[PDB]
A paper describes a structure:
In support of this goal, we map the epitope of human monoclonal antibody 9H2 which is able to neutralize the three serotypes of poliovirus. Here, we solved the high-resolution structures of 9H2 fragments of antibody binding (Fab) complexed with live and inactivated poliovirus serotypes 1, 2, and 3 capsids. For each of the Fab-virus complexes, we find that the binding site overlaps with the poliovirus receptor (PVR) binding site and maps across and into a depression in the capsid called the canyon. Thus, 9H2 outcompetes the receptor to neutralize poliovirus.
To make complexes, 9H2 antibody fragments (Fab) were generated and purified from the mAb and incubated in excess with virus capsids of wild-type PV1 and 2 (WTPV1, WTPV2), Sabin PV3 (SPV3), and Sabin inactivated PV1, 2, and 3 (SIPV1, SIPV2, SIPV3). A Fab model was calculated by submitting the 9H2 amino acid sequence to the SabPred AbodyBuilder38. This 9H2 model initiated the build that was guided by the presence of disulfide bond density visible in the WTPV2, SPV3, SIPV1, and SIPV2 complex maps. The α-carbon root mean square deviation (Cα-RMSD) was 0.7, 0.4, and 0.4 Å for live virus serotypes 1, 2, and 3, respectively. Strong pocket factor density, equal in magnitude to capsid density was observed in both inactivated and live types 2 and 3 virus-Fab complexes; however, there was no PF density resolved at any contour level in either the inactivated or live type 1 virus-Fab complexes. Another noticeable difference in local conformation was seen in PV2 and SPV3 VP1 loop 96–103 at the fivefold, which is located within the Fab binding interface. For PV2, both for the Fab-PV2 complex map and the X-ray crystal structure the loop was disordered. VP1 residues 96 to 103 are disordered in the WTPV2 and SPV3 complexes in contrast to the inactivated complexes of the same serotype. For types 1 and 2, the live wild-type virus superimposed with inactivated Sabin with a Cα-RMSD of 0.3 and 0.3, respectively. The number of contacts does not correlate to the 9H2 neutralization, since types 1 and 2 are neutralized equally well, and type 3 is neutralized slightly less effectively. However, Type 1 and 2 have three residues in common that type 3 lacks: VP1 residues 166 and D226 that map to the north canyon rim; and VP1 P282 on the south canyon rim.
Numbering used by the authors:
A (entry chain L): 20 to 129
B (entry chain 1): 25 to 97, 102 to 301
C (entry chain 3): 1 to 235
D (entry chain 4): 2 to 9, 25 to 69
E (entry chain 2): 10 to 271
F (entry chain H): 23 to 148
The structure:
């Protein structure tokens, strides 16, 4: 598996709600609570949007939310706006003490 | 309790041969010094009271070190999943046996310190140690609604007090605590994909006993204070049920895995004393 | 209120105390116990099990399965020893990592007799005789059969019953011994010698193995709990 | 309703809580049974008899 | 005399003439669930002679260079007749075992095997990732698995093996192999006995358990002394393992679980 | 404050990255290295911990990379011993300073990466 699986692209209209999944395996998402999400725009350094599961850094708006379902995790953006267009990366911790990023998801606003 | 007395023995010349035996049977040859040498009568006053399993386990062992801060909004609350497996000593003592059943006496030793010089001084802090049973909600912030603790047990500790103490009963869903579990949580079935049915080896329940959530109840002082809560775990009313050899190489993870320290014995010659 | 006076030792935490404490899960319905086989009530029940000794321990043999095998052969008779041991069962490296020695490293003081049980793993056509000796301390450790036969010894005849037990008797100046390799409470010397030789016919292997076992007797006891040096945890 | 037990001269214990997990450990029940690990044999051996193998 | 023994369990009979005295593990014969210990409410099936009989596992070859062998119970009987069918048709199952190991050699051979019965015989993995061994390697069936002389990390990150790597002096679990004698055991020493018999009760922290998920007993056979023979080229002798489940009862009948393989 | 050293090009040969941070974050926090090929996404490269002189490398690059520290000037270095054409990527220096609430093992705090540097493009072509 190595890298965590993500859908390549997700599309949504303004004001709708989207869910971006991140499916790993039993040794990263299914074992640890150390699952995080990042947001990246072109040319920019990535911005942390979710750090623990269900928990947001200060300054991140309340329309970003996430949850675990065992071996897979999700990021929900509710009431989509045009500034949310960008690339979203899943992140997790493996039990051999390596860290692993997801494959990314280009979210585009219709 | 008393040991058997050493009985007096004369010289033997007999068909009875207690020295010869058969370790192929799996029986230990149950000899005394009376069977192989001449012995005098000795009334024995030693006892095995300190070698009982209750005496073997009646000590408090440090199991976790929970860091927490009092700070201007970095770690304002901390959660620790309850396990003995991350400290090696109580783990090795428990892993002498396969199954166990005990009541448990938690003890919390709290220490705190300043972390900067300039920004004044602080009043006495109050610490909340909330038990989260598995399925109760984990806090997202230090001032979340989860700290209302309507059904969760919760120790409030004042700094400078004696260490807080909690008894919990035998909470296991089985009839004994399983130190070792030769199995899986799920069986992968034919026709399932590679993303389904996988589970960790030896894992059993992934959240067996829940977690402890630690916060400082006070508002922030202008200086950052950092506190460490040390959790001390002492078994009582202990019963144990299937003896195992003790661990010889360093521990690696929650399971029985090893990678390093695989040469535990030193070099000594065959005929040197 | 009742007039009370706080004694010294108030508000301490002693890690071996026996006090009562409040319960965080009151009125809990405990799962009832079942009769699982094998219940241990004393750790000295486990010390009485015969447990194989890493006797050999040389540089080509340590930390392999060859550490347990001592090699005999059908060579001509000599009074040089086969194996040697000190009676320091928690601090001799041959004896420390036995189950007896692992229980003993959790304790500071030990007393009682020991059983040393040796198993001959050669052919049925191979027969021989052996001298297993125990020398109480205070003398030069026995380097020949002629010295060791003055001590406590058993003559083993290797016949149909493949195993022999040498009971090391409890001979000590002190009621207990220190477990930390101190010369005041040293236990003495254990060694094994050929008496005659192992005689082997034709079309039979000439090299043979002997495996050793250690266990405690019913007069054995320990009395001061302590942490081991065998386990550690890096940062 | 106190419990008086000999220390080896007496000492007194009173349990103050309803939960049995709250109790102190007793200085008691020193019994042992080593035969199930050291002699777990179907036909009972006698140590002076020939243990054939 | 004690060397000669006959075991009869449900139209299977084992006779031996050079037995050591058999081991009943922890002094406890196998037994059915008493009413004071029953967890499930449904009526158990007790297959009796259709399941409580000796099955012969596949023969392994002892060599001078060989390291040792291991099996899991009830996993090694998952294809053995109506016991395997009752195991895969029911959620919960419980059985004791009579374990018979057969290894015959001449009076001019030498060597000794320690046969160990281990409750909850966990085995160490092959990689830096903890607890990562898959079901298909931890439940190998009647072919069992082999101990190894040394530890070896799996360096493959793309297609990891997810296997066991049981080191023989570390007994697969990080404990000294000489200290494995506190488990119920017999020794097949070739000059005295040619067979070993261990009767194992059902040992668990529950009165009944999911047999497809969990293995109660492991059988480990280690050469304590290596096999040797006077011929200058080589030698091999067979080892046969014959197991009868005992006091079988099963609860929770449903459709058949077919587990994933290879 | 996190600074990243320049941008580079050469085929074949070794390349040394440099990242300098503030003294407090150098004293307390671990530094993580992340690379990103154009349009292909983030790849973790490893960790250097100047608080306890320890380092971890990712399994794709474990033979190739090496991290060091410069304690008198709060600087860490990342050296790739050889270069391939797939290594044409934007590279990131990151500081882990957002603490997890969950205790790592039972004795340590776990930190997520939340401060990211300006970065360094390296291209490997003739
Ligand atoms: C306020 C403090 C509350 C503490 C709650 C403690 C939860 C129960 C912990 C039991 C630990 C049992 C250890 C044995 C586990 C096993 O090896 O199966």
């Amino acid at each position: 598996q190595s890298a965590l699986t993500q859908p390549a692209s997700v599309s949504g209209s303004p004001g709708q709600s989207i869910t971006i999944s991140c499916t790993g395996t039993i040794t990263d998402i299914g074992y640890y609570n150390y699952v995080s999400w990042y947001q990246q725009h072109p040319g920019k350094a990535p911005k942390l949007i979710i750090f623990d599961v269900t928990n947001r850094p200060s300054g991140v708006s309340d329309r970003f939310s996430g949850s675990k379902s065992g071996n897979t995790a999700s990021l929900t953006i509710s009431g989509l706006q045009a500034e949310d267009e960008g690339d979203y990366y899943c992140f997790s911790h493996r039990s051999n003490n390596i860290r692993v990023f997801g494959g990314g998801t280009k979210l585009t606003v219709l | 309790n008393n040991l058997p007395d050493t009985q007096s023995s004369g010289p033997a010349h007999s068909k009875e041969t207690p020295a010869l035996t058969a370790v192929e049977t799996g029986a230990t040859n149950p000899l005394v010094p009376s069977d192989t040498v001449q012995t005098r009568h000795v009334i024995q006053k030693r006892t095995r009271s300190e070698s009982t399993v209750e005496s073997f386990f009646a000590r408090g062992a440090c199991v976790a070190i929970i860091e927490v801060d009092n700070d201007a909004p970095s770690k304002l609350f901390s959660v620790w999943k309850i396990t003995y497996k991350d400290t090696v000593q109580l783990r090795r003592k428990l892993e002498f046996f396969t199954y166990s059943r005990f009541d448990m006496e938690f003890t919390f030793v709290v220490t705190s310190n300043y972390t900067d010089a300039n920004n004044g001084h602080a009043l006495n802090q109050v610490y909340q140690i909330m038990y989260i049973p598995p399925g109760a909600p984990i806090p997202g912030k230090w001032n979340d609604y989860t700290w209302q603790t309507s059904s969760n047990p919760s120790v409030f500790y004042t700094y400078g007090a004696p260490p807080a103490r909690i008894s919990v009963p035998y909470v296991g869903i089985a009839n004994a605590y399983s130190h070792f579990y030769d199995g899986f949580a799920k069986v992968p079935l034919a026709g399932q994909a590679s993303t389904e049915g996988d589970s960790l080896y030896g894992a059993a329940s992934l959240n067996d006993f829940g977690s402890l959530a630690v916060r400082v109840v006070n508002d922030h002082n202008p200086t950052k204070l950092t506190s460490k809560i040390r959790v001390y775990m002492k078994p009582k009313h202990v019963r144990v049920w299937c003896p195992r050899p003790p661990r010889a190489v360093p521990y690696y993870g929650p399971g029985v895995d090893y990678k390093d320290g695989l040469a535990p014995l030193p070099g000594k010659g065959l005929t040197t004393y | 209120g009742l007039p009370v006076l706080n004694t010294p030792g108030s508000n301490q935490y002693l890690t071996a105390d026996n006090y009562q404490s409040p319960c965080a899960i009151p009125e809990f319905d405990v799962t009832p116990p079942i009769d699982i086989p094998g219940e241990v009530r004393n750790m000295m029940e486990l010390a009485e099990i015969d447990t194989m000794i890493p006797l050999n321990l040389t540089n080509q043999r340590k930390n392999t399965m060859d550490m347990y095998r001592v090699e005999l052969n059908d060579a001509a008779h000599s009074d040089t020893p086969i194996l040697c041991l000190s009676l320091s069962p928690a601090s001799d490296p041959r004896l420390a990592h036995t189950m007896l020695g692992e229980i003993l490293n959790y304790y500071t003081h030990w007393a009682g007799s020991l059983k040393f049980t040796f198993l001959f793993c050669g052919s049925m056509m191979a027969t021989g005789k052996l001298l297993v000796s125990y020398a109480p301390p205070g003398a030069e450790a026995p380097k020949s059969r002629k010295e060791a036969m003055l001590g406590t010894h058993v003559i083993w005849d290797i016949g149909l019953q493949s195993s022999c037990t040498m009971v090391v008797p409890w001979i000590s100046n002190t009621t207990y011994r220190q477990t930390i390799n101190d010369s005041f409470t040293e236990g003495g010397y254990i060694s094994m010698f050929y008496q005659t030789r192992v005689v082997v016919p034709l079309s039979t292997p000439r090299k043979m193995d002997i495996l050793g076992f250690v266990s405690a007797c019913n007069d054995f006891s320990v009395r001061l709990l302590r942490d081991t040096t065998h386990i550690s945890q890096e940062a | 309703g106190a419990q008086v037990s000999s220390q080896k001269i007496n000492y007194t214990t009173i349990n103050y809580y309803r939960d049995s997990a709250s109790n102190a450990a007793s200085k008691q029940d020193f019994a042992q049974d080593p035969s199930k690990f050291t002699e777990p044999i179907k036909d009972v051996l006698i140590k002076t008899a020939p243990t054939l193998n | 005399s004690v060397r000669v023994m006959q075991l009869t369990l449900g139209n299977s009979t084992i006779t031996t003439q050079e037995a050591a005295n058999s081991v009943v593990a922890y002094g406890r014969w196998p037994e059915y669930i008493k009413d004071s210990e029953a967890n499930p409410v449904d009526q158990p099936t007790e297959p009796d002679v259709a399941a409580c009989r000796f099955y012969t596992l596949d023969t392994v070859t002892w060599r001078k260079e060989s390291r040792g062998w291991w099996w899991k119970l009830p996993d090694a009987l998952k294809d053995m007749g109506l016991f395997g069918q009752n195991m895969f048709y029911h959620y919960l199952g419980r059985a004791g075992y009579t374990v018979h190991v057969q290894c015959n050699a001449s009076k001019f051979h030498q060597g000794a095997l320690g046969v160990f019965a281990v409750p909850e015989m966990c085995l160490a993995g092959d990689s830096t990732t903890h607890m990562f061994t898959k079901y298909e390697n931890a439940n190998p069936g009647e072919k069992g698995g082999e101990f190894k002389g040394s530890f070896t990390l799996d360096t493959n990150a793309t297609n990891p093996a997810r296997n066991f790597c049981p080191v023989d002096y570390l007994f697969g679990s990080g404990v000294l192999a000489g200290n494995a004698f506190v488990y119920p055991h017999q020794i097949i020493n070739l000059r005295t006995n040619n067979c070993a018999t261990l009767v194992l009760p059902y040992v668990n922290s529950l009165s009944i358990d999911s047999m497809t998920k969990h293995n109660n007993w492991g059988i480990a056979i280690l050469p304590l002394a290596p096999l040797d023979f006077a011929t200058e080229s080589s030698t091999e002798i067979p080892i046969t393992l014959t197991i009868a489940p005992m006091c079988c009862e099963f609860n929770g009948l449903r459709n058949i679980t077919v587990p994933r393989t290879q | 404050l996190v600074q990243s050293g320049a941008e580079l090009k050469k085929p074949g040969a070794s390349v040394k990255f440099s990242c300098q941070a503030s003294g407090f974050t150098f004293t307390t926090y671990d530094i993580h290295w992340v690379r990103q090929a154009p349009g292909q996404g983030l790849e973790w490269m490893g960790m250097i911990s100047p608080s306890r002189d320890s380092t971890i490398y990712a399994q794709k690059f474990q033979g190739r990379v090496t991290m060091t520290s410069d304690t008198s000037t709060s600087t860490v270095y990342m050296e790739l011993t050889s270069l391939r054409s797939e290594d044409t990527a934007l590279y990131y220096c990151a500081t882990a300073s957002r603490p997890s609430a969950w205790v790592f093992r039972s004795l340590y705090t776990y930190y997520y990466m939340d401060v990211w540097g300006t970065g360094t493009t390296v291209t490997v072509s003739s």
